[PDB]
Amino acid sequence: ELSAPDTRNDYNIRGDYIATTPALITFDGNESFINCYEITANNNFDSKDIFNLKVRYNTLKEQLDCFITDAVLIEGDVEWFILFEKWKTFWELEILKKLKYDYDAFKENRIIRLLKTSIDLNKTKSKIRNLCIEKAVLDKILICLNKVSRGIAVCNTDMDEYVRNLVPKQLTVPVQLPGFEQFFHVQFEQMETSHDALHDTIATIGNSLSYTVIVENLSGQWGQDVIDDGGYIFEILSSNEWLIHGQKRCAIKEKRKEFEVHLIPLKKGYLNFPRVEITNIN
Amino acid sequence: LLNMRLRNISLKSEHCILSSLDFQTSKASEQLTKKFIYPQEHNSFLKLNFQEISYKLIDGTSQIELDPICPLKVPLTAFSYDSISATFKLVLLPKSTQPHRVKITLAYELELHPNLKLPVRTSWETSLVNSKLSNVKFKFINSNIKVIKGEKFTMRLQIINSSSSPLDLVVYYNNTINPITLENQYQLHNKYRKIAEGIILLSNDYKIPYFADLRFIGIMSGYYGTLSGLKVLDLNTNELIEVGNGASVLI
Amino acid sequence: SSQVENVDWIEYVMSKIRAESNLHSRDFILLLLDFRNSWIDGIKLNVQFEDFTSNEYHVEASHTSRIIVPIKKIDYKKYNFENTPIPRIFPGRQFIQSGLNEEQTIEMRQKFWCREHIISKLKCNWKLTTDQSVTGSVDFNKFIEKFDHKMVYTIYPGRLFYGVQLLLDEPKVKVGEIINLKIITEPTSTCRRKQNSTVNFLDIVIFDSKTSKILPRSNRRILYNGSLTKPISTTKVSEINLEIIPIEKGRYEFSVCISKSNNQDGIIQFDSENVILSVI
Amino acid sequence: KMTRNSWMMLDGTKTDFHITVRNKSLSCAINHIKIIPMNNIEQMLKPDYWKKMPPDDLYIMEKQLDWLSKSCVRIIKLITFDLELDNTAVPFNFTGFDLLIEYGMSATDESCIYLKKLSIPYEVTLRRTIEVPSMDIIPLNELFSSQVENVDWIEYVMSKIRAESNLHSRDFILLLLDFRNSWIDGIKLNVQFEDFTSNE
């Protein structure tokens, strides 16, 4: 969840992620997880506030161990009543050296242990005061998890509100540029070929320096290329801009710059300091 | 020298090679002159670039550009007017004399006589597919960019060869998927699944005997540039000859 | 679109996409077959399927004319195509061992039974030009030689590993509508095959309407809340879901792709539903 | 180098310019629009055949081979110019016709006949579409009874034996001619005499 700031300054959000049913991920970063949020605007359009987020993460080695301590060993009202009743700290010392192999936890299996040993663990269980039935259930559970597999069953049944949720937080604060303006160009396809049927990109950029430049590029086409060299009159408004070309080319190079950030400063009348140019085929 | 410039000539195989020299009064003299003018309280100069035309050859003719040139006078601008030039048949590179003039109306309306007219060599700096076995060449008489809806259309192919064995070619369009990184793994498939599903050839296995009107209808729409399914083949010494030419928009 | 109703096989699937709107498009297939006459006369060639009426064709002396006959698919949960295979004309006989693998027997049963299904409703009719009396028909039993693996995919959808459908509600979306996409997955009659993998992985891929291969970080484009892997259950239905917040372009297509693991080239089904939405 | 045509009156607009050297790329001031080739061939070929109706010993049959090309010329007035519209207009061509050429005249003058020559090679073959290799003539003598008006050539001589009864029967003859096509396509073949309309 994304947090509106403590000023409660009417920054509206539209999207938010509550994975109630999909309590399921894997984050080796070759695959990409992306979360996006649609912040809206208030009555006033400002720059800096505080933003935090409630990442309610967990660990897979908590989840599969809470499955293994409640289904594969102690799923009865007798064994968890008398056999592993008060010796649970020995189980919580036995669990944290298990090293379950997670490379096949999401490829046709789950809870398949790696190549540890069990004779030293059995000798440690014998050297304490463990009973024969409790050692029978524990040796049966470790014998089953010597080589095992699982489906996606009990993905939340074996952790249905029986787990901690280490709710982290961070601070993102809506970074902004230097100069704010608004242009509007005017395209005219004086094409050397017939038409390339180009596909649009109505850009809206920003620039953060002083005595600077805010360049732009035209649309990208896919027909017989290096052509449709358009005609353009600038018609920039509410500023004192610069120029790069009149009647430029939509070829392999475009280079339609506008170095307007060397002058004509203004206020931060938007959420940041931007410029949204928009050409039109006329 | 103040107005830095470059000569860009672009070469196309539609017998055209356009020329658009770009000009930009860059920072090198600007950093001195616009601090002398800043001491004289000026930072918006206006050198009235209004007179410019090109020259072709010894017959120094003002060639008609594709774009216009009005009175252009402002500060820190940059301009590149596009001019249509006829492409030569060979490497006969017409050297050119780029002529321009800007009357530098400085601060306190002070005009200064200057021009940018010099000459150089205007080199560009750089349908049919031939066979592999015979003297046969393939071209399409109808224009390779054409408009149609999802309905029927007529398409016409040139076969010109040597008349030593002037015969026995076959067409077939081969509407099946070439069976083939994961996003490229679903990009090559989606290329092939619109090659082999888009158009269908309504007379395949067409025996040729020069002229033949090949008979297609297209199902789904897009830009089928180098529509590459169709394969003619020489029945003696079977080589997979391809005609990867032509296009069809279906909107 | 309208006014294309001048071509004989269009108006069948138009006339059942107007009425009976449950029977959708992108599932009607065309079977394409070329006549060729070994005779000096013209033939008039009106083809009937169970209700399709081709117009008055003409084949002169060598000129093939590929008839484009539109049919529907078949439903794998409606017919069983694993029934007693290649039934003998006369009961009894020696009863010798088949001498073939059980899997081979499966594909031989499918490649026979789909063939007789398209035999059983296709009837040509014809008449000569220069006489206009000697009408006739053909039968296609000696004509259709066999099927191969493209054909048994295209008529029979149950040969595929999974069968999905996927709907996006209200395809006119302006800019700011986070809108869930709905996927309904159902494993086919080849749920019996593998069964040692119990999870398979479903990449949802994003295409532009005109151009291709939108990169998955996807700025100024569809933004997605979640991720595009979403593992699915073998032998049970599973309704995956993903929310699309679009930024700015014209139109896009969604499709899925199943891959049996997460390594390279373990990929099994290049599936092709491809719904398009329109964005202002 | 273009390619073949059938017996239709088509046209050609060729792509490449010739040299046509002059001062510069200024306007040529007289550009041809209808080039009209093969309008020399119908005052070659009828003066061929109407001196083939006596036995051939003339100067027009004296080792002439200008029928292989029938090369016309295009004359003009005062650089390179793209090719015009031809309107090739082939309907009366001999079967030995296989090539053409165009010796273009590049004019420029003050008071002078100062010209040049610019020549083009053209190869073209022929679609021998339909042929009538024979005819024969049969007269007739029967007056045909009513309800036979289902056959296209009956009703002409019926319709002028009903009206204009001076124009009798047994003097109308039929000329009988057989088409045969050397082509893969069908042909529809509506014949007109001065008023007779054959069917499709």
Curated annotation (Swiss-Prot), chain A:
Name of the protein in question: Trafficking protein particle complex II-specific subunit 130
Family in the record: Belongs to the TMEM1 family.
Cellular localization per UniProt: Golgi apparatus
Designated gene of the protein: TRS130
Record text on subunit structure and interactions: Part of the multisubunit TRAPP (transport protein particle) II complex composed of BET3, BET5, TRS20, TRS23, TRS31, TRS33, TRS65, TRS120 and TRS130. Interacts with YPT31 and YPT32.
Biological role stated in the UniProt entry: Specific subunit of the TRAPP II complex, a highly conserved vesicle tethering complex that functions in the late Golgi as a guanine nucleotide exchange factor (GEF) for the Golgi YPT1 GTPase. TRS130 plays a role in the YPT GEF activity of TRAPP II in concert with the two other TRAPP II-specific subunits TRS65 and TRS120. Required for both the cytoplasm-to-vacuole targeting (Cvt) pathway and starvation-induced autophagy through its role in ATG8 and ATG9 trafficking.
Additional notes on this entry: Present with 432 molecules/cell in log phase SD medium.
Taxonomic source organism: Saccharomyces cerevisiae (strain ATCC 204508 / S288c) (Baker's yeast)
Swiss-Prot record, chain B:
Superkingdom of this protein's organism: Eukaryota
Positions in coiled-coil regions: none
Segments passing through the bilayer: none
Subcellular location: Cytoplasm; Golgi apparatus, cis-Golgi network
Miscellaneous section: Present with 1660 molecules/cell in log phase SD medium.
Function: Specific subunit of the TRAPP II complex, a highly conserved vesicle tethering complex that functions in the late Golgi as a guanine nucleotide exchanger (GEF) for the Golgi YPT1 GTPase. TRS65 plays a role in the YPT GEF activity of TRAPP II in concert with the two other TRAPP II-specific subunits TRS120 and TRS130. Involved in cell wall (1-->6)-beta-glucan synthesis.
Subunit structure of this chain's protein: Part of the multisubunit TRAPP (transport protein particle) II complex composed of BET3, BET5, TRS20, TRS23, TRS31, TRS33, TRS65, TRS120 and TRS130. Interacts directly with TRS120 and TRS130.
Protein name in the entry: Trafficking protein particle complex II-specific subunit 65
Lineage, highest ranks first: Eukaryota, Fungi, Dikarya, Ascomycota, Saccharomycotina
From Swiss-Prot, chain D:
Subunit structure: Part of the multisubunit TRAPP (transport protein particle) II complex composed of BET3, BET5, TRS20, TRS23, TRS31, TRS33, TRS65, TRS120 and TRS130. Interacts directly with TRS65.
Miscellaneous: Present with 259 molecules/cell in log phase SD medium.
Full-protein positions shown: 857 to 1065 of 1289
Name of the protein in its database record: Trafficking protein particle complex II-specific subunit 120
Cell location: Golgi apparatus, cis-Golgi network
Similarity annotation: Belongs to the TRS120 family.
Function comment: Specific subunit of the TRAPP II complex, a highly conserved vesicle tethering complex that functions in the late Golgi as a guanine nucleotide exchanger (GEF) for the Golgi YPT1 GTPase. TRS120 plays a role in the YPT GEF activity of TRAPP II in concert with the two other TRAPP II-specific subunits TRS65 and TRS130.
Native source species: Saccharomyces cerevisiae (strain ATCC 204508 / S288c)
Superkingdom field: Eukaryota
